[PDB]
Design a protein around this ligand. Sequence first.
Ligand SMILES: [Zn+2]
Ligand SMILES: [Zn+2]
Length: 65
Amino acid sequence: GSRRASVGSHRFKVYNYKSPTFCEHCGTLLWGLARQGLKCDACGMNVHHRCQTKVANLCEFIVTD
Ligand SMILES: [Zn+2]
Ligand SMILES: [Zn+2]
């Protein structure tokens, strides 16, 4: 089946956003045409590069057997 996992760290990777997107740590716009911020590979959370180390929430995602 599947489980709702909740883990201690995100897996952030630089991402190229295609529409105006806001930082899920600080709230403000991820500015630019490209490389505007980091998307978590596991849950999709978007943050600024400069906000990465400040992120304090759990990373939640569905795991399917
Ligand atoms: Zn995450
Ligand atoms: Zn931010």
